[PDB]
Design a protein around this ligand. Structure first.
Ligand SMILES: Nc1nc2c(ncn2[C@@H]2O[C@H](COP(=O)(O)OP(=O)(O)O)[C@@H](O)[C@H]2O)c(=O)[nH]1
Ligand SMILES: Nc1nc2c(ncn2[C@@H]2O[C@H](COP(=O)(O)OP(=O)(O)O)[C@@H](O)[C@H]2O)c(=O)[nH]1
Ligand code: ALF
Ligand code: ALF
Ligand SMILES: [Mg+2]
Ligand SMILES: [Mg+2]
Lengths: 450, 271
């Protein structure tokens, strides 16, 4: 729907100009409504729209085929850039034990996240993990975390509803430091931003254990309240990251964009399922790619774009390799054009001042020499041509054995090619008239031939 | 006057009502205001409450558990909407006027769900039928209904496992549960409850859609309204699917369950 709406909008409003702010109105409105149906926070929607405007002012769109497609490309790039980077991971470098604190609303899946991160850090990172339940409120929450910990093979710290979260996490931290645990996972009760006592509680806990990692667990189906929750939780605690859960649903998941924008904290994890063994890393491009459904439209476009890309790549590379300078390719061309057009008898006539000093019969026969040169060049691979400085003795052996001649002749032609390269380089650096007039006839004295 | 349009639009958008329902409501409010020529804001608020009141007029039907032995209420919905807590509240709520209540644990998947519903059952001092984690849910619920018929239990609440609507196999499992429940009583379940979180966005439309296309939901419970989430999507699902709203949880405590009232919902909405 996005591509269709944008293409339709850019087509119906303006013809082919260079896109201007006046043409992006209905575009921005349709994108706005698209994000509103995506359950994205309205202020985030507006602040994104502003960036879309800033990118719309300078559009290079006119030179392409489909304006809506490249506009979609720009929006996707900006959105991915807004989602942050990849390979985001908790800091297990930390001085052990590493303390990870959980925060979020009720039924956010914080406990299941503790189980997932438990199995993940235990198996993959080879870490010794201790888990503890700070929840004295929710019935059988401690038993749940204990069960999950028993399933993932992670040691569990005993706790009950008769205790207090502070003493619980303090005893857990003490036990973690005493038994030399690598990672301390702290699960806490789901709480509302409108609750003062619970916020003071999680603040006292965060102050008590001083966690190196504070994770914010929010549902993917969360609505406009995600703004309030993200803001309040961000102002209450110095979040080190955000953990999104229930991404496997059909939900739009604009709440991720909301929290990411408002808090400014990166998303390090995406729950892909209910089970403990199911966890996925956060990929900005994957999340920013899909809120939609469609078919058969994007395939042809992606194909054509690929064709244009590979064509422009090959055509630019072909000019780039030939634009490096003078090589054995151009030398080969000049040599075949030589042997075809060879003017030795005529060039002896064309030259006047050089014939008065040098011998008249000193001119070598073009046919034999240039056939030898052509054939010897034909014994060379394309790499030794474009890059002549990689030629060594063994390659000279291959060449000489291939053409059925002596290596000294190969060295001779490499010398002549060196001379030609130097000369043509001097022609490229200076003027052809300054360089043609700079040509000098060397005489070692005023005596002829001495 | 455009500032009023923008303001009202933003107010309706931050309530998670949806753009379609917003378009409809704004349109009808525009026609109504143009017709009645209201020059004051209070009359605009009143007319708005009248329109949305007409939207909630169909869904105001209360739940009646009387007349059936037992009266089976199937609690369904997505993950973490607090179905179990709602059951824990409904236990005492149904215990108050003298109706005997028994609880059934239908979630054998999630950890310590059985133990949780056993805690909620202990708080209400009522028998709870469950077996073990990993057991067949339909069998447990079936045995619960049979026992309820033998024990002459007035009201039986049957829990279910948290399931996403996009998963078809779980839907087929729930359909199996219902089909099994059709054996003892043809009209069972008498009440199908969809528990929706207030923080839920437009996804609730799809949730209610598939759950209605599957289980044939006879009711909807909106919990977690003690936060800043007003759950305005309920207007959309009530518009499309016309499903009644039984109650609203105002908190985690057992006394936090209240009968759904349109006027109170309106009062809490704009505030
Ligand atoms: N599909 C899916 N379900 C999840 C995920 N995380 C949690 N859940 C569900 O959430 C339910 C319990 O949530 P819970 O962890 O007890 O809430 P919390 O302890 O307050 O964070 C479980 O039944 C899970 O099915 C997830 O990443 N994906
Ligand atoms: N504040 C508040 N919390 C709720 C409400 N309903 C449920 N909860 C919380 O949600 C938590 C877990 O929900 P749960 O019953 O396990 O989800 P479910 O069993 O999958 O439906 C419980 O600890 C409750 O405290 C509500 O209406 N208000
Ligand atoms: F349901 Al919780 F912390 F486990 F709110
Ligand atoms: F946490 Al549940 F069904 F009890 F998803
Ligand atoms: Mg928990
Ligand atoms: Mg449950």
């Amino acid at each position: 729907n996005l591509t269709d709406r944008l293409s339709r909008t850019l087509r119906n409003i303006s013809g082919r100009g260079r896109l201007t702010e006046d043409n992006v109105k209905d575009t921005l409105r349709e994108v706005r409504m698209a994000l509103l149906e995506a359950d994205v926070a309205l202020p985030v929607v507006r602040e994104f729209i502003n960036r879309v405007k800033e990118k719309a002012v300078g559009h290079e769109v006119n030179k392409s085929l489909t304006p809506g497609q490249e506009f979609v490309k720009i929006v996707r790039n900006e959105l991915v850039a807004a989602m942050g980077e990849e390979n985001q991971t908790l800091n297990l470098a930390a001085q052990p034990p590493a303390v990870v604190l959980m925060a979020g609303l009720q039924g956010a899946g914080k406990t299941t996240s503790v189980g997932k991160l438990g199995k993940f850090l235990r198996e993959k990172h080879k870490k010794k993990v201790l888990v503890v339940s700070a929840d004295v409120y929710r019935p059988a929450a401690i038993k749940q975390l204990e069960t999950l910990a028993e399933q993932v093979g992670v040691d569990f710290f005993p706790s009950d509803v008769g205790q207090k979260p502070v003493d619980i996490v303090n005893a857990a931290l003490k036990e973690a430091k005493l038994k030399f645990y690598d990672v301390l996972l702290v699960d806490t009760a789901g709480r509302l931003h409108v609750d003062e006592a619970m916020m003071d509680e999680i603040k006292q806990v965060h102050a008590s254990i001083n966690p190196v990692e504070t994770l914010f667990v929010v549902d993917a189906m969360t609505g406009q309240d995600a703004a309030n929750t993200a803001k309040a939780f961000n102002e209450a605690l110095p979040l080190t990251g955000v953990v999104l859960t229930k991404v496997d649903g059909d939900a739009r998941g604009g709440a991720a964009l909301s929290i990411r924008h408002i808090t400014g904290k990166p998303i390090k994890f995406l729950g892909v399922g209910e089970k403990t063994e199911a966890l996925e890393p956060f990929h900005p491009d994957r999340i920013a790619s899909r809120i939609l459904g469609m078919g058969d439209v994007l395939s042809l476009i992606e194909d054509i774009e690929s064709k244009v890309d590979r064509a422009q790549a090959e055509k630019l590379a072909s000019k780039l390799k030939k634009g490096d300078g003078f090589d054995l390719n151009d030398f080969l061309e000049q040599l075949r054009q030589m042997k075809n057009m060879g003017g030795x008898x005529x060039x002896x006539x064309x030259x006047x001042x050089x014939x008065x000093x040098x011998x008249x019969x000193x001119x070598x026969x073009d046919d034999k020499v240039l056939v030898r040169m052509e054939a010897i060049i034909n014994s060379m691979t394309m790499k030794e041509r474009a890059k002549p400085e990689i030629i060594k003795g063994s390659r000279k052996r291959r060449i000489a054995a291939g053409c059925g001649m002596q290596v000294q002749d190969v060295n001779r032609l490499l010398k002549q090619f060196d001379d030609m390269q130097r000369m043509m380089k001097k022609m490229k650096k200076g003027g052809x008239x300054x360089x043609x007039x700079x040509x000098x006839x060397x005489x070692x004295x005023x005596x002829x031939x001495x | 006057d455009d500032d009023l349009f923008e303001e009202l639009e933003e107010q309706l958008l931050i309530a998670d009502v949806g753009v379609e329902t917003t378009r409809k409501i704004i349109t009808n409010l525009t026609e109504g205001a143009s017709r009645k020529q209201l020059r004051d804001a209070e009359a605009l608020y009143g007319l708005l409450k009248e329109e949305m009141g007409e939207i909630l007029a169909k869904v105001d039907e209360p739940l009646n558990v009387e007349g059936k032995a037992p009266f089976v209420i199937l609690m369904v919905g997505v993950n973490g909407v607090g179905k179990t807590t709602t059951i824990g509240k409904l236990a005492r709520q149904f215990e108050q006027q003298g109706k005997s209540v028994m609880l059934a644990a239908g979630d054998t998947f999630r950890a310590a769900a059985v133990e949780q519903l056993q805690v909620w059952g202990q708080r209400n001092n009522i028998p709870v039928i469950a077996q073990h984690t990993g057991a067949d849910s339909a069998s447990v619920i079936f045995d619960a209904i049979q026992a309820a018929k033998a024990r002459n239990i007035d009201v039986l609440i049957a829990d279910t496992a948290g399931r996403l609507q996009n998963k078809s196999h779980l839907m087929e499992e729930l359909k199996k549960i219902v089909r099994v429940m059709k054996k003892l009583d043809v009209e069972a379940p008498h009440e199908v409850m969809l528990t929706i979180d207030a923080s839920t966005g437009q996804n609730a439309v799809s949730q209610a859609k598939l759950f209605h296309e599957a289980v044939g939901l006879t009711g909807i419970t909106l919990t977690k309204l003690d936060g800043t989430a007003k759950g305005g999507v309920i207007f959309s699902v009530a518009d499309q699917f016309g499903i009644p709203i039984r109650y609203i949880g105002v908190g985690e405590r057992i006394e936090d369950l209240r009968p759904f009232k349109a006027d109170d919902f309106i009062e809490a909405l704009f505030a």
